[PDB]
Amino acid sequence: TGKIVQVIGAVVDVEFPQDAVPRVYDALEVQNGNERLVLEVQQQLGGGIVRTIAMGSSDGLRRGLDVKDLEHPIEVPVGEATLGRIMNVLGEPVDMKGEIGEEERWAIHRAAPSYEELSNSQELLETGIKVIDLMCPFAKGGKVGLFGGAGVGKTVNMMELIRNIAIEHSGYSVFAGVGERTREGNDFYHEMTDSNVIDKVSLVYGQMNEPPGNRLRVALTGLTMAEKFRDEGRDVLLFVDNIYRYTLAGTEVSALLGRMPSAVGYQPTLAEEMGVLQERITSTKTGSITSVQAVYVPADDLTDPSPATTFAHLDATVVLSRQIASLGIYPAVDPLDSTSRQLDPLVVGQEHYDTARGVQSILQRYQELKDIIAILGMDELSEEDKLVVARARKIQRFLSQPFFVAEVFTGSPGKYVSLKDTIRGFKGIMEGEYDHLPEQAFYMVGSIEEAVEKAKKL
Amino acid sequence: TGKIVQVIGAVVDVEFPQDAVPRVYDALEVQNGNERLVLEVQQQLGGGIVRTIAMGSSDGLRRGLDVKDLEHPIEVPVGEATLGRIMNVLGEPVDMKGEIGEEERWAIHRAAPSYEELSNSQELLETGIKVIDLMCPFAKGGKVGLFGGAGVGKTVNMMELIRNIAIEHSGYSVFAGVGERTREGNDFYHEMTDSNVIDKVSLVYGQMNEPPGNRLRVALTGLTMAEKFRDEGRDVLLFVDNIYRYTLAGTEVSALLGRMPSAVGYQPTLAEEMGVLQERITSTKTGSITSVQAVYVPADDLTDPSPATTFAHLDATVVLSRQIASLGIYPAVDPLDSTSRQLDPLVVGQEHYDTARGVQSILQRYQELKDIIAILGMDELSEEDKLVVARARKIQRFLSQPFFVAEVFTGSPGKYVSLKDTIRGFKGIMEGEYDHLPEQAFYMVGSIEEAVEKAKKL
Amino acid sequence: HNEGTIVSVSDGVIRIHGLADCMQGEMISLPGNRYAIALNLERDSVGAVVMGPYADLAEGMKVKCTGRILEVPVGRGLLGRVVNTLGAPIDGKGPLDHDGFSAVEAIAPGVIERQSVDQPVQTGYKAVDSMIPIGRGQRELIIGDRQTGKTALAIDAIINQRDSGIKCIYVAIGQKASTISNVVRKLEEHGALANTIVVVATASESAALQYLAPYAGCAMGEYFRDRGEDALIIYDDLSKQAVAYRQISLLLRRPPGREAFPGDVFYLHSRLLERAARVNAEYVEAFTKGEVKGKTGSLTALPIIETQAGDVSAFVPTNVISITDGQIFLETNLFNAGIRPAVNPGISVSRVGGAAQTKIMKKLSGGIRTALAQYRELAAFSQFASDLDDATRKQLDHGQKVTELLKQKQYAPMSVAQQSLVLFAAERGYLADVELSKIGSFEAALLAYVDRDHAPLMQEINQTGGYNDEIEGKLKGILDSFKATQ
Numbered sequence A, B: 001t002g003k004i005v006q007v008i009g010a011v012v013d014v015e016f017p018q019d020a021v022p023r024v025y026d027a028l029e030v031q032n033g034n035e036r037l038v039l040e041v042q043q044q045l046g047g048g049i050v051r052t053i054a055m056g057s058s059d060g061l062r063r064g065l066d067v068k069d070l071e072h073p074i075e076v077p078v079g080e081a082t083l084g085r086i087m088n089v090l091g092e093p094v095d096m097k098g099e100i101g102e103e104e105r106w107a108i109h110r111a112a113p114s115y116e117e118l119s120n121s122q123e124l125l126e127t128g129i130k131v132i133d134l135m136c137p138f139a140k141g142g143k144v145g146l147f148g149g150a151g152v153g154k155t156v157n158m159m160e161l162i163r164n165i166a167i168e169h170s171g172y173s174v175f176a177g178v179g180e181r182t183r184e185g186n187d188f189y190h191e192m193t194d195s196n197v198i199d200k201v202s203l204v205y206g207q208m209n210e211p212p213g214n215r216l217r218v219a220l221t222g223l224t225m226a227e228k229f230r231d232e233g234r235d236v237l238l239f240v241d242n243i244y245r246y247t248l249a250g251t252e253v254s255a256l257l258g259r260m261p262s263a264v265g266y267q268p269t270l271a272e273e274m275g276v277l278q279e280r281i282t283s284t285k286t287g288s289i290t291s292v293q294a295v296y297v298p299a300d301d302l303t304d305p306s307p308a309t310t311f312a313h314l315d316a317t318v319v320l321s322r323q324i325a326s327l328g329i330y331p332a333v334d335p336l337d338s339t340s341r342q343l344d345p346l347v348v349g350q351e352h353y354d355t356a357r358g359v360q361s362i363l364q365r366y367q368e369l370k371d372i373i374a375i376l377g378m379d380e381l382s383e384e385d386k387l388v389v390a391r392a393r394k395i396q397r398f399l400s401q402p403f404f405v406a407e408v409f410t411g412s413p414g415k416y417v418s419l420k421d422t423i424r425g426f427k428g429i430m431e432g433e434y435d436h437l438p439e440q441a442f443y444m445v446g447s448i449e450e451a452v453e454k455a456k457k458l
Numbered sequence C: 001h002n003e004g005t006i007v008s009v010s011d012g013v014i015r016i017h018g019l020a021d022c023m024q025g026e027m028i029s030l031p032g033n034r035y036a037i038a039l040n041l042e043r044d045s046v047g048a049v050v051m052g053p054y055a056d057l058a059e060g061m062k063v064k065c066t067g068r069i070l071e072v073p074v075g076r077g078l079l080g081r082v083v084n085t086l087g088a089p090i091d092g093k094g095p096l097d098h099d100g101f102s103a104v105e106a107i108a109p110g111v112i113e114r115q116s117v118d119q120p121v122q123t124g125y126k127a128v129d130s131m132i133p134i135g136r137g138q139r140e141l142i143i144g145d146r147q148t149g150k151t152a153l154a155i156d157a158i159i160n161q162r163d164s165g166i167k168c169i170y171v172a173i174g175q176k177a178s179t180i181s182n183v184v185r186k187l188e189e190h191g192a193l194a195n196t197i198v199v200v201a202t203a204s205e206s207a208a209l210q211y212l213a214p215y216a217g218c219a220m221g222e223y224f225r226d227r228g229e230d231a232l233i234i235y236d237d238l239s240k241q242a243v244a245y246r247q248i249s250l251l252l253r254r255p256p257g258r259e260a261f262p263g264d265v266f267y268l269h270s271r272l273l274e275r276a277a278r279v280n281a282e283y284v285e286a287f288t289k290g291e292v293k294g295k296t297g298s299l300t301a302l303p304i305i306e307t308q309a310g311d312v313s314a315f316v317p318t319n320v321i322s323i324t325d326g327q328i329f330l331e332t333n334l335f336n337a338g339i340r341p342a343v344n345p346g347i348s349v350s351r352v353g354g355a356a357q358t359k360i361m362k363k364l365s366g367g368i369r370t371a372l373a374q375y376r377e378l379a380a381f382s383q384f385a386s387d388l389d390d391a392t393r394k395q396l397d398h399g400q401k402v403t404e405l406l407k408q409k410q411y412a413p414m415s416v417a418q419q420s421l422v423l424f425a426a427e428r429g430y431l432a433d434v435e436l437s438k439i440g441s442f443e444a445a446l447l448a449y450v451d452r453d454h455a456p457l458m459q460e461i462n463q464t465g466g467y468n469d470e471i472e473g474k475l476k477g478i479l480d481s482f483k484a485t486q
């Protein structure tokens, strides 16, 4: 129907003369060196030309070849037919079974549910993680976010969350890796196929290896599935690896899309690009969505725009700092900068709350004393403050615990702590019960009764 | 044979007949007022036009004007006729005319990056300076950073290092004054004529005085002169007044050419600008250039790109300490803080390496005991330790030395010691021997026996 | 028609007018002849970056676009020869053996196409082969300040592959020609260069020449993974690449981001390291066309990142850490203080972990990790006039002499055999009782001797890690016997 006019990386613009100027968000194909190549219309540039983004390698596109325009925004299957296996950003079967698939189909571009159509509950779910359950809980129909620089266990943390709540689930899960390592995805598929739990999950993979187009759209093709499952069946889980990889993709493009750069070279549309996608995930009257997601923080800067703006869109926000990892605590959660909107007394009971804020306080009071200690030594503290740091350093390493998924690369066998025990232990240490025990007694153990038994060996 | 079209600062734009448009690095020459105005082309700007930098003041240049392109990529006089005389970037006799009767003339923009023209030796450059040869030895065809500044005899160290490869070695040395004061340049010229080394160095000047074009290119003009002596068969010394001023000058130009700002406001082309200046100074299988360059670390942040880049090129560092100068040891090199990756390895040889590492300990162990002594009794220091403080006290007086260029200043002849006598002398001292000689014995003299005879003279 | 003429050229960038049937990524041919890569395809002109010198390209020069895009001689004839970034450009012999060609730009194998990494790649260094195992088809970072042994560690891992069946590749990016020359001279000296091809882009070469070199070197190693053979490539200094790419990016006027790097710098490293992986039996069959008919190839890759002043939280370092499935921090101060395999435990990791090691390794290496990161926890003592000795004194004195065991000289790779040293002698009790610190490192060398004679059988355990229920007690004997030699 039309022809190429320019080609700049992922951005190619097409001339289509008036008759059929493609609708703003709309697909269209191109024959390159060999195979089909879907472009997505992005901007109706003036003069009958149109900006698009290659949903594949833009390499090998001639400056003049014809391109056919269809009316379909994006072709992605939805429903129980998808549960089987892995999908593309285009909704293609990336795995080795020609999909039986769709009884229906939806566009990856959708609207956020109506305000009055939005629901919410307070039925808290219990993760195995001691830090998370105590410091920041969430009810089903919640938005959890894992912030962390590179190499802070970002992935392994999500996978442990998954193995813990994808069991109590008894429902339909929708994992959607985006901008991640492919090696993890292959293992997650094989690992989950042996446990036979694939038939209730649904994969979709836009790799960090794939071109820009695939990444900033695969996040959408991901949840548009969870949305279908929502608008029918009620309880769905939605796991997303690196929402950042999606925003980051949109940045590699923003230059070629020809808009001025915002702060730190980001797109001026960061505010909305995030909100659109992030506003889609919610508990409808018809069905709720529980969702955790690994939001990357560039160069460790929590002030960097991606994290900064992403914060508001989360119910519970647990953050992993490199400082806490550099110690040995490998649920590397900073219990101070990490919070939830539902650490409310009326919601989580008073015992959980008082224990949480108690633990929070003494741990913060310790951060203050940390300065004078380093300059003038321990022997300068009052006998009371002396006890504060000692009790704190117990808490500081009782927060730790070995993950099952993490057994592979560390000898330590995994453990799983009751939300009940998490309270019993910390409340306990704070009362001053388990003082006599050395610090190492608390480092990397399950319930407090493990800290006790470890103290015996040493 | 061409017309000027635009003139903005040192950036004049000249357009030519489209059939014969100048090559990138070729030189042009306008005639403005009295003097010509050699120009360096920088960019094949579109439209048959060419953009250039003025090797002089652009002032007075009338818009429409004639300039004749030549094939010369701005070439300079090279050969044994240059030394003893000062020249500016253009290879003109800046010193009061002698007319620099040349013999040849090389381009300054040659690519000296060779392959398999470069040897496989890794031979060391024996300098004759005890401190250096032992603690921070030079590599033949290597780069060495000279950190120091004023009041530490930095000039005399150059002058000596200059006469040493001139007498005990065949070749000569080229000094390149890029970007520093003019007053100094004069004083330095007279210090060389007084220390009678002037006859053996070719020197090139491009002070703070001159336009950006000069400072940026002045290094290369001096570099090629050395490259001439190299293909000539000799080993040579390339002094760079201040490499920092060179890279900084590259920023002014890159700014005038309107190039974008990179990290910390440096040029995006500083990674390459450095790699070419440096990679041209090396040891070919026909000769070798070895360069000692004064370094400047902005705000004492060796993380700043100007240092952090120049550092990934240096193969050695000579550090002049003011406190080491105070005492009286007068190659003011600090035995520690002075590094050389040509000693670290096997490659010098094991005996040299261990003697070197051996002094790096006895000399350091002496510091830790130097404040356990001021505060406490020197007597309560164990046997082996006050014998360490007895030996270290002695090596530091040994690795001092009298220079030839210093005979005018002093009166003391001073000398040149091999690598072998230096190892023998130092290894001999520190591993049980010469303990009977007084500490005075080892001030200011050559090989160890020179010191042994110094003991009788007492 | 398919031709054009250079309208403008500056700083390695070029703007060709015409070239109708030119395409994205296509390698345009120029006089010389050099090439140039079409990055832009604007309405009228075409932006391209010169793959080499550009000091002589002028206006009106004839430009004739070739057929395909950006590919270069892969194959098996490449090893034993140093090769220029773009391709065949040889040193020093004249010819070279293509199996064919292969695109320097390429998509990483699929998600369903993969096979979990089971196999081990021994580095030779005992410090890394124990606590941070590298497996076939894994990406392991080698990050640390300048002059900490990043390069030295890389080449030793290559030298140790001289007869493991794994084909090696060294990619020098923006490295001094002198250094690269001495690396290959020592690559042959210690044997063997023949098993490893070495792509090189010296510090003086083009910026485009530098930033593409990793991909060129990669595609050459990719030939082996698709083929069902295993391979190992090490990208020297991805930091020097990223800085080279930033040069071109800013010359093209692309808007800078954090630390002035283009926003796509992550994608730059991402699509490269993603190439390195393990391909399962089916993929190798499909690619091989039924010739290999049942084997899994792999491209193990360990890149190098040069940090400034230990600032690991910098932009580029963080991205490469985010990509690779593990890392190895060479600490600057551990290195100064003699601990040469400066690997910093408790911070260095290999997420593939257990699977990446042999049987006899992960059984023993479990006890080595505990002591090392937890011997530096009570570094406070500095081994002094003791306290609480039975506990604190033991664990420290033992640990201090294990760290001296992990200490190694380069060019001296310990096979899974000399792992007897690490496995037994250290962890459980042996060396701790007799040897003093200095004898602590020496004794190991002479133990390695007494087995070279009295353990040609053990040549079978390094064939299969086994550690059979019996072999446990079998090795226990050879150690006690050594307590009758030295």
Ligand SMILES: Nc1ncnc2c1ncn2[C@@H]1O[C@H](COP(=O)(O)OP(=O)(O)NP(=O)(O)O)[C@@H](O)[C@H]1O
Residues within 6 Å of the ligand: B312, B341, B344, B345, B346, C144, C145, C146, C147, C148, C149, C150, C151, C152, C153, C306, C340, C341, C408, C409, C410
């Ligand atoms: N395992 C080792 N044993 C003994 N010496 C070592 C060892 N590893 C490195 N070195 C020394 O470290 C020095 C330099 O190592 P090198 O491989 O250059 O580090 P690098 O970080 O690649 N430095 P750079 O080239 O500046 O980035 C050499 O002189 C070696 O002798």
Ligand SMILES: [Mg+2]
Residues within 6 Å of the ligand: C150, C151, C152
């Ligand atoms: Mg190196």
